[PDB]
Design a protein around this ligand. Structure first.
Ligand SMILES: [Mg+2]
Ligand SMILES: [Mg+2]
Ligand SMILES: [Mg+2]
Ligand SMILES: [Mg+2]
Ligand SMILES: [Mg+2]
Ligand SMILES: [Mg+2]
Ligand SMILES: [Mg+2]
Ligand SMILES: [Mg+2]
Ligand SMILES: [Mg+2]
Ligand SMILES: [Mg+2]
Ligand SMILES: [Mg+2]
Ligand SMILES: [Mg+2]
Ligand SMILES: [Mg+2]
Ligand SMILES: [Mg+2]
Ligand SMILES: [Mg+2]
Ligand SMILES: [Mg+2]
Ligand SMILES: [Mg+2]
Ligand SMILES: [Mg+2]
Ligand SMILES: [Mg+2]
Ligand SMILES: [Mg+2]
Ligand SMILES: [Mg+2]
Ligand SMILES: [Mg+2]
Lengths: 56, 147, 125, 53, 187, 52, 128
RNA sequence: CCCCGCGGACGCUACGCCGCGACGAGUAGGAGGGCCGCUGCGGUGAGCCUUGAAGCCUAGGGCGCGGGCCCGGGUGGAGC
RNA sequence: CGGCGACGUCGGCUACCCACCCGACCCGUCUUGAAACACGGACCAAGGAGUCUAACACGUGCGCGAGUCGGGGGCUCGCAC
RNA sequence: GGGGACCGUCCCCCGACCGGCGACCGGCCGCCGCCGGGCGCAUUUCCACCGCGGCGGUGCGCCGCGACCGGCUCCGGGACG
RNA sequence: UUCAAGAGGGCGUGAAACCGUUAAGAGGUAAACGGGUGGGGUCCGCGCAGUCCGCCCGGAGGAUUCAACCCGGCGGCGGG
């Protein structure tokens, strides 16, 4: 607690965090989420295939 | 080659890899195996158990030639003769068995490690072990002693 | 073999010049004069070389014959092309492309021939 | 120095050393149809860094 | 600043043979291409063993190779060893073996060929099976070395059976105090 | 003076080096890379009659 | 006039001054050639502010313009006409220059041949 | 069955080249690389040099993160 | 797309001198702690300190491999090497 | 002790069948390319010159300006729920 | 005189410390130093009307003159 500030994000915070600063850990690399194919290739087996699915 | 050594890489480093605090002094700890019972006791006990003390009977004027008795195992017995000796005996119709004189090959005692191929052989040696004789007789061979 | 001979001379050769963070190779049939497996003019069963003509006009295209690899006296066939620049490049292009003779050196030989012919026309004051 | 078929007749135990690679023609080996049949297709497209807009 | 440690960043492994043998380097070039351009994990194991040091490539005796190739379902398979095949004079009969080795001893080679067997180098193995199909990849005894008798717990500790370093072996060399209960202690 | 000036090499390795040196002296690329001006030499394992 | 390079990118030098040795100003016995300080209390080694800077890898030049002269070429030291020929196919990126020990009679022939081959010489009028 | 065009950049010293991601304090100490430097030997450069070697001097031009190096001018006079 | 260009100006500067603003205590060493009222150091040149032998241990490279090794001796025009 | 026979390897041969002419080579052919000489002697081909010519690449001797596009960032208006 | 005495009997070369003189600059916080600029100076740049070269178009000129064929030489590839 002395080291963190936390709270309850709303929908708009989740959108802007994923859209502006969203990077994926793809093959241990920090890859910018520029295309939906990056999400669908690693998380498509869970039904998550787009930035909207990830945000949801 | 002196160009491949640490002394070339230690030029410019004041302590030459031996530290500033403890330095490189002449003989801290003694010379040779000094203090093997006092301040190097842990090293001597840890890596050289049995180092101190006497065990057994001393024998003056040991002549190693008297106890010279090289040994050969059964698994290498057939290497002392040529392969032709072996294959001729195997395809031999009669019961003739080749003679292997291990003394000629430079061994005195025949030990019994391993197994023999199933064909009789006459083995000449100074000494045999109990199991070596047992296995030679198992394949139909004979043990004959020489002096 | 070319690969085996390359592992012997890739760093130990009398034609090897290592200087100024650069590496050059000066054997006769090396287009681009670089120390490389592809451009080495000694280790291959078929090599292409382009040299200036002895009289100072035209180029000499030397190619390695297939049969006598161990016989260096007869291993190289040299021809002299002393026509205009465009037809000279066409002859070298047809030598390499049409014959399927070492087609990875086609532009290297064409560029070298252009450099040789340009060096033979008179200098500019 | 002998052949690989027969040992040297003037050195009494010497025989020519063996090859650990019989065919050193690397380009011929790689281009052989049996090698080429087992290969996956080359990945010759360069994927440069994408500027995150 | 980032709260990380950098003492394990650099993985310590052979990325290439330390040897300058140009024939080994050529078939490293061959199997570096095979490992990259195929999906066979056999090529990856063979390539990493080509990098390996000699103590990591122990010799494989003829008896051990025969025994491992005599296991059920391994008939008509190529025994591949990245190292030397060594003759064993403790075996009397050599079956028909197809083997690929980095080196084969002169006497082991003569025995294999008389049996009707076949010997391949690693470039011939690449042509015969680029993906390493139908092979039995074998290794010599890695810990069959004298150094491993001295490795382990120290000899002067209880329940340790590790060989000590002694210049000579005899009743006067490291057998009294710490070796028997009659002289101090045993452990 | 007792600096161990001399080295002993195995006879099998010394024989090996002779075989490698002889084999390399039969390849024109390797001999020219030594710089031996063998360009008009008729054949590189160059053998002459015994009259020499 | 002068032979142009193939491309002339802007060359960026992270540092232009030299890294002088610590305290080489105060003494003649200490040359300006850089020596890494290793004293226990040495404030240059400890990197105190306002001190003499220490070379590190971060000052490395861009690999595209490294060893590149202001003209855009890269020099190659030649000693005779034969070594000049190796730059025939590197005209637009490498410039020859004649070694200091080459005589005036022979460096005339190097300059004449280089003009024929369109090879740039950094010191063409050097002994005349 | 490409052919009114007969043609089509570079590359791959594989010990090379290319791409992507993260990271970068350091005494004692360890390791690697050094196309950093000195002297001598085996090879090699159909190397350099009295039309000027070594060495030295230099408000001269530069290269390299750096160790250092190259080049111009002067002096020098025989080797590098 | 504009201006400007030879006996005055154009570009350059790592390098020479000078000025200004900010920063800046003298290195080496022992030390928990050195700028120390702790010691050595007036200055410059040249010289100057982990070496060789033997013996172990482990790692690595090479050859051969249940073997391996001629190192002592001998034979080979006794000898430029 | 000699001389034999046998076995194992070898070194040459007398011949055929099998896989290949290969990175061990020649002769014939077939295709292709280059070179030399003829012929072709002009709407072809080539050579050099001029245009303040165009289309490409590179780049402006020096000093500067503008425009739009994109990345990052700090701000400001206006409107909606 | 000598090639040279800027080789003159402890005389090849002739560094640094240190000193004299000349030239330029500066000077009340001892000097010296790092970063950033500015001014001056010495030099450098064949600086001073500013690259180059591929194709095409037009203009005016020259020519061992081009393609296709024939002869010869030489290669490359293939052939039960
Ligand atoms: Mg340190
Ligand atoms: Mg010191
Ligand atoms: Mg202490
Ligand atoms: Mg006590
Ligand atoms: Mg760290
Ligand atoms: Mg610099
Ligand atoms: Mg100084
Ligand atoms: Mg401290
Ligand atoms: Mg960091
Ligand atoms: Mg660090
Ligand atoms: Mg002290
Ligand atoms: Mg104290
Ligand atoms: Mg201090
Ligand atoms: Mg005090
Ligand atoms: Mg005092
Ligand atoms: Mg004291
Ligand atoms: Mg004092
Ligand atoms: Mg003193
Ligand atoms: Mg000194
Ligand atoms: Mg003089
Ligand atoms: Mg004098
Ligand atoms: Mg003065």
């Amino acid at each position: 607690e002395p080291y963190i500030a936390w709270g309850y994000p709303n929908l708009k915070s989740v959108n802007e965090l994923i859209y502006k600063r969203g990077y994926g850990k793809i093959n241990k690399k920090r890859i910018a989420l520029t295309d939906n194919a990056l999400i669908a290739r690693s998380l498509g087996k869970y039904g998550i295939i787009c930035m909207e699915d990830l945000i949801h | 080659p002196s160009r491949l050594r640490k002394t070339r890489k230690l030029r410019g480093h004041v302590s030459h890899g031996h530290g500033r605090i403890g330095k490189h002094r002449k003989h801290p700890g003694g010379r040779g195996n000094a203090g093997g019972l006092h301040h190097h006791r842990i090293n001597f006990d840890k890596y050289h158990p049995g180092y101190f003390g006497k065990v057994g009977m001393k024998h003056y004027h040991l002549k190693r030639n008297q106890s010279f008795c090289p040994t050969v195992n059964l698994d290498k017995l057939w290497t002392l003769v040529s392969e032709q000796t072996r294959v001729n005996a195997a395809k031999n119709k009669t019961g003739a068995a080749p003679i292997i004189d291990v003394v000629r090959s430079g061994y005195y005692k025949v030990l019994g490690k391993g197994k023999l191929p199933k064909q009789p052989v006459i083995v000449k040696a100074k000494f045999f072990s109990r199991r070596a004789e047992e296995k030679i007789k198992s394949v139909g061979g004979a043990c004959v002693l020489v002096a | 073999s070319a690969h085996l001979q390359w592992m012997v001379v890739r760093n130990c050769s009398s034609f090897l010049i290592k200087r100024n963070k650069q590496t050059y190779s000066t054997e006769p049939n090396n287009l681009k004069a670089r120390n490389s497996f592809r451009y080495n003019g000694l280790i291959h069963r078929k090599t292409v070389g382009v040299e200036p003509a002895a009289d100072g006009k035209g180029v000499v295209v030397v190619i390695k014959r297939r049969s006598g690899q161990r016989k260096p006296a007869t291993s190289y066939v040299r021809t002299t092309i002393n026509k205009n620049a465009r037809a000279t490049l066409s002859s070298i292009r047809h030598m390499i492309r049409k014959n399927k003779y070492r087609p990875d050196l086609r532009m290297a030989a064409i560029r070298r021939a252009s450099a040789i012919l340009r060096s033979q026309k008179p200098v500019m004051v | 120095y002998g052949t690989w078929r027969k040992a040297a007749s003037l050195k009494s135990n010497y025989n020519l050393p063996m090859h650990k690679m019989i065919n050193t023609d690397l380009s011929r080996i790689l281009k052989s149809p049996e090698i080429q049949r087992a290969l996956r297709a080359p990945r010759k497209k360069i994927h440069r860094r994408v500027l995150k807009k | 600043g980032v709260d990380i440690r950098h003492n394990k960043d650099r993985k310590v492994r052979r990325k290439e043979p330390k040897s300058q043998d140009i024939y080994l380097r050529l078939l490293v070039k061959l199997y570096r291409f095979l490992a990259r351009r195929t999906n066979s994990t056999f090529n990856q194991v063979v390539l990493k063993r080509l990098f390996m040091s000699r103590t990591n490539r122990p010799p494989l005796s003829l008896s051990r190779m025969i025994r491992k190739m005599k296991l059920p379902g391994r008939e008509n398979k190529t025994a591949v060893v990245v190292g030397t095949i060594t003759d064993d004079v403790r075996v009397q009969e050599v079956p028909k073996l197809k083997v690929c080795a980095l080196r084969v001893t002169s006497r082991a080679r003569s025995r294999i060929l008389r049996a009707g067997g076949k010997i391949l180098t690693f470039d011939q193995l690449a042509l015969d099976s680029p993906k390493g199909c139908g092979t039995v990849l074998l290794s010599g005894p890695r810990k069959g070395r004298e150094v491993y008798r001295h490795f382990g717990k120290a000899p002067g500790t209880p329940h340790s059976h590790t060989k000590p370093y002694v210049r000579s072996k005899g009743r006067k060399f490291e057998r009294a105090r710490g070796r028997r209960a009659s002289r101090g202690y045993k452990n | 003076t007792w600096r161990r000036w001399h080295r002993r090499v195995n006879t099998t390795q010394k024989r090996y080096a002779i075989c490698s040196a002889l084999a390399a002296s039969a390849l024109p690329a390797l001999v020219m890379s030594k710089g031996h001006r063998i360009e008009e030499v008729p054949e590189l394992p160059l053998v002459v009659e015994d009259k020499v | 006039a002068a032979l142009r390079p193939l491309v002339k990118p802007k060359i960026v030098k992270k540092r232009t001054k030299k890294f002088i040795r610590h305290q080489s100003d105060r003494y003649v016995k200490i040359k300006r050639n850089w020596r890494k300080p290793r004293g226990i209390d040495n404030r240059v080694r400890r990197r105190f502010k306002g001190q003499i800077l220490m070379p590190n890898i971060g000052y490395g030049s861009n690999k595209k313009t490294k060893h590149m002269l202001p003209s855009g070429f890269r020099k190659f030291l030649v000693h005779n006409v034969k070594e000049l020929e190796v730059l025939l196919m590197c005209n637009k990126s490498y410039c020859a220059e004649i070694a200091h020990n080459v005589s005036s009679k022979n460096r005339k022939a190097i300059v004449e041949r280089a003009a024929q081959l369109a090879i740039r010489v950094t010191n063409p009028n050097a002994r005349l």
